[PDB]
Amino acid sequence: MKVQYCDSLVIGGGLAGLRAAVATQQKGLSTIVLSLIPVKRSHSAAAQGGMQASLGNSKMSDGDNEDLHFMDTVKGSDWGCDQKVARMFVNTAPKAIRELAAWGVPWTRIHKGDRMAIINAQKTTITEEDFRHGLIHSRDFGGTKKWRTCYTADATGHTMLFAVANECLKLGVSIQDRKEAIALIHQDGKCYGAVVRDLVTGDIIAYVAKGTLIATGGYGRIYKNTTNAVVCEGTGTAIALETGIAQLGNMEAVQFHPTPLFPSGILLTEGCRGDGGILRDVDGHRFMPDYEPEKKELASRDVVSRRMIEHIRKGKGVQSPYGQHLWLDISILGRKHIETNLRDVQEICEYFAGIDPAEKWAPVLPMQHYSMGGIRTDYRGEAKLKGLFSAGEAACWDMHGFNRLGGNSVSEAVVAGMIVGEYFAEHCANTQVDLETKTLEKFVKGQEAYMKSLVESKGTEDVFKIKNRMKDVMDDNVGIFRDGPHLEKAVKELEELYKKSKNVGIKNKRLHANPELEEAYRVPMMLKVALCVAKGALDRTESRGAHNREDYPKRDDINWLNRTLASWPNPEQTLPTLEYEALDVNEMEIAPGYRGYGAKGNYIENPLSVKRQEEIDKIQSELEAAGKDRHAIQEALMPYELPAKYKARNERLGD
Amino acid sequence: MKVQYCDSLVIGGGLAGLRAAVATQQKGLSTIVLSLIPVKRSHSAAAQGGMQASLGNSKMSDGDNEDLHFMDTVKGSDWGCDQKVARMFVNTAPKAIRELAAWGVPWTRIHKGDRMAIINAQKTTITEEDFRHGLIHSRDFGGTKKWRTCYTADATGHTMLFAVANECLKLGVSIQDRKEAIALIHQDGKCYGAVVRDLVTGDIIAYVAKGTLIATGGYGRIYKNTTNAVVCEGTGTAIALETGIAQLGNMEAVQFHPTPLFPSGILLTEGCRGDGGILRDVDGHRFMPDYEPEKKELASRDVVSRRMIEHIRKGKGVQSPYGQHLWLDISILGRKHIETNLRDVQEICEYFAGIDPAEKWAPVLPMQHYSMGGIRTDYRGEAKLKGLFSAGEAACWDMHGFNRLGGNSVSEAVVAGMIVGEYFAEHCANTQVDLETKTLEKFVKGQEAYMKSLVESKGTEDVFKIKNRMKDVMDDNVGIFRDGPHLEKAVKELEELYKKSKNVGIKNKRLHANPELEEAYRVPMMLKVALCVAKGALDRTESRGAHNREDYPKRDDINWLNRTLASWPNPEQTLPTLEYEALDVNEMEIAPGYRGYGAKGNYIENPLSVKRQEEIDKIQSELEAAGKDRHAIQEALMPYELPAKYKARNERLGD
């Protein structure tokens, strides 16, 4: 038997995984990072919008602080997030930027002077003072009133990921790629590591550690149309769910982006709309104003996506051999504006769409983008399965609720990596584990048996046809608009698809470098993941954040101010087991109210919200009058935790 | 923390270790072999006499079989061996040769014809039939009547070791050299591996396995004069003794060789005496006939060594700046006889003694050669500490008793490696282990602390002066002739030397590649080992095999037909704890009698020997008359065990 031991095992080499690996290595814990591919190729590298953090450096950032950021995040989540976690987040975000800055991340800087700026509420000019010069800049992104999205030109994710990966190399972390975690080792409700398959040799190896962290990214590829990389299939989520102990949180909370290139799904940054981009239909008609006379194509993403789907349903969509789409017209911004400010958008359309965005229109359509759902954890990042932690998009640390804020996901990866990294490091150093060879042997022989059975199956089903059918079902039934009747149809079919997936047969019989065999065990996992999203989408009879139930348009704060928890305790069952974790309003710093975007009074008000609201107004006013800083007031409304290391306040310009 | 896991951990890369490694790897057990130096440089490579095995191929081998070999071994052991183990041995020896033969070991072959041969009972000519041609040859060695010592010209150990090492490479065994086991990991009386120090980096690493085998060789370097390599310091033995659970068997049973080159200790093969070599004193007087008129310089080694020491004591020894020695005259054999039959002895004397053995006399003196003692095990090779096995010279499997047979030690290494290898393999595959990080951490941090303390000691003692003093004490008091008064003096001084060894201070402070630090922790181990030999030599008031007590000249079969068992249960004690394992005559296939060499009736007869002897004569005659093969008779006298794989009988020429 092959066994590898390390104090801290990290599954996932993206921003969250690598940063967490830094936190454990820097304090003497031997740590291994497992990854499907070279770590600096993770989906994190694709980020081009930026990272949200309240620095308050630039003119449009002036006045910004933890409180403002915190609020956008909570109201953005539609109150489905753990506000305490959101506080831990907003507070540490500033120092994540600065640390990355200290590590070489080439953040775009501010320079004294006036500049051409688009506010589309006034496409006026902005002035940056001299004392702001040389500090980290920010851009308008995510719809926040305060511009706090930091960026490194148009390759933010790229540079960020490279810095963290390089720190890992500097600290001597063990990066092992082309290695896939296919199962978690656990006994008596504690995680002891993972059974891993070497994608090249095909060897099944047991990786044991005192603590295991899953930072496997999103499960976006369970949809046919998605912005995600081809490696975001949620298997990380799956192996956690397959322990029968750990739980998945809000898997039905999937977020879509409105303007990905159709049909490839290659992202066309939000800056297109923000700078003036125009959405047109089959007739070339600018339709957003029709639906949103005020904000027009500058409405919140959530809205735009819905409108685009509505318009298409009204039969005004473009007919294409890959389906219906709409048009994105950026040409009206001028050629000089594109070749300098959107020089990267011009390359995307040429290389992949075969068009010049300054001369032609780009085919677009909303598609799956971010996964709010994930392995459920406490504020420390630990799952119900002791010793198993999760961070980043793969988790449901839950600071996103039902709508993650644009710019908050890459931010969360690094931040959670820092905070969970600490808690994880502490767990590993302090906990003492009892490793039984009998158990290691059970899990390793177990997966060897499984691989063998796959290679020997005489089943007649095709893994690809099964996989493709799954992504169609998800796209057609679990997208932007959902209704009970269709969800039931989807759940039923996904469950049937799951059963047939076990009668798959593959042509290639080898155990090493076998892409066909990879699909063989992955698709079944992807199906169990899809079932949690679909079935959870069916059972949640309300419309919250990204979850829109046509048959239940109003957000139900009475019966649904909770969190969906999925599990699969019985390996023989064919549908996920759902439970709910109620969000206690009494622990909220901000009581459930209007979110800012969309219809109004579109929510069944909960009576305890009102009571709590007063409690808030009361306590706030008494201290606010008694001469008290925003800090003391915050502590009085909702005290949160933070590792000692990140407890410090964030110095800002104008302090 | 650094942890390496394998199913089967082997400490020692000599014949016994490597062969055992083959046995576990060939059956799918991942196995690691740890060694101080490259495995093919082990002391095993030095063997030039040959390997004893009853093939019965050659003329002088004709008639040979398991029974004859078995008897030489038991009577040779002076009845201190486990006869059942000796049976397991003699039976498997033949197949060890043949397997090595199948592996390429270039065994010298037989060729039809007559040849010049020396029997010194008749220096006549020998004839090898045509049906013997091409089969494995044998030579006169070990004093056995039947010539059964197989050899590969004059580098038997060399070729044998290379074949086994190469098989290890072929099977993909993990050979990790410049790695030293400095402590054994154990909890609840079970061995889980070993704490290892990387001699190059200085890293302390924990090697965990389901089974650990110690095949570390002999502890000969605790003497000043020894044939052993500089790496035979018994640390393997020490780490076993330091667990407080495992026991050492007959550590006082040390064997000496009579003709090593003085003072280097470089061996001058027994073929010198056998071919005609003459022993002379300071006056050039051939003295052996004086003491042994019959056998003369052809008496058993045991005798020759004693005579040489007696003669020296009588003041007839040569005075040299390194002490007193005697002379070995091979010149009288002629120049042509040496340059063809002893061409290798001629090189030894020139390169190291600066003399031509065909023109001058070589300075000689008896010196420590083989260690019968070692980690005590059952017939399967397992120690009192479960999961810990031992094989080869490092063990006390006990087939040697108080006098190992010349040609039986390299034979035992490979044989035990095969048999213990099987039992070891079975243990590893079947047993299930519970590895607690708390324990691994205790032992690893424990040895790190120790190294650190060594490097920081302000002690003023010198490790080398302490080490050298130890080897003098052993040479002067625990050699060929021993008496109570002197042994008490030695024990007392060794115990004082041990205490001062803990106040050692070393100049070089680094933790990597530090030969001074190596001596720092090794010498203390060597001292605990010496104490077991010395103190066990003091408490055994009798003269048996290599153990000669002048004050107790007779072999006591009444009070000493037992085995010395040394332990060190309390880390605070300063002297080994001895106990005795009684040898049950009722389980002996051969009752205690005369050994063949030396004085006669020199043993306090045990009454149960006689009773048993009849039981033997009776049972033998009844079956011998009732028409029964030597096999059925053996089974009736003393049934022994053998792994299924080696249960087959040994086909011989003339069957």
Ligand SMILES: *Cc1cc2c(cc1C)nc1c(=O)[nH]c(=O)nc-1n2C[C@H](O)[C@H](O)[C@H](O)COP(=O)(O)OP(=O)(O)OC[C@H]1O[C@@H](n2cnc3c(N)ncnc32)[C@H](O)[C@@H]1O
């Ligand atoms: C898709 C996307 C997302 C995105 C974005 C643009 C695109 C095209 N732009 C963003 C932006 O401007 N601002 C922002 O805040 N977020 C943006 N996002 C979303 C964001 O990039 C993600 O939320 C974030 O990158 C998630 O980071 P995370 O560290 O969690 O994950 P990852 O980078 O995907 O890496 C996952 C790693 O896991 C390994 N893996 C996965 N499964 C396994 C298994 N089974 N075994 C072993 N390793 C596994 C992957 O190899 C990978 O390295």
Ligand SMILES: *Cc1cc2c(cc1C)nc1c(=O)[nH]c(=O)nc-1n2C[C@H](O)[C@H](O)[C@H](O)COP(=O)(O)OP(=O)(O)OC[C@H]1O[C@@H](n2cnc3c(N)ncnc32)[C@H](O)[C@@H]1O
């Ligand atoms: C010294 C000697 C012995 C000898 C002989 C000639 C000489 C000069 N000629 C012989 C002969 O002709 N016929 C015969 O039957 N025996 C003869 N012998 C004795 C024989 O060679 C030995 O009994 C035999 O070789 C012992 O084999 P074994 O496999 O037990 O041991 P080894 O070869 O010495 O190797 C020991 C290995 O252990 C490693 N080691 C030791 N301590 C440690 C620690 N603490 N940690 C890690 N590794 C360790 C050594 O590196 C070595 O590889």
Ligand code: NA
């Ligand atoms: Na998530």
Ligand code: NA
């Ligand atoms: Na021994």
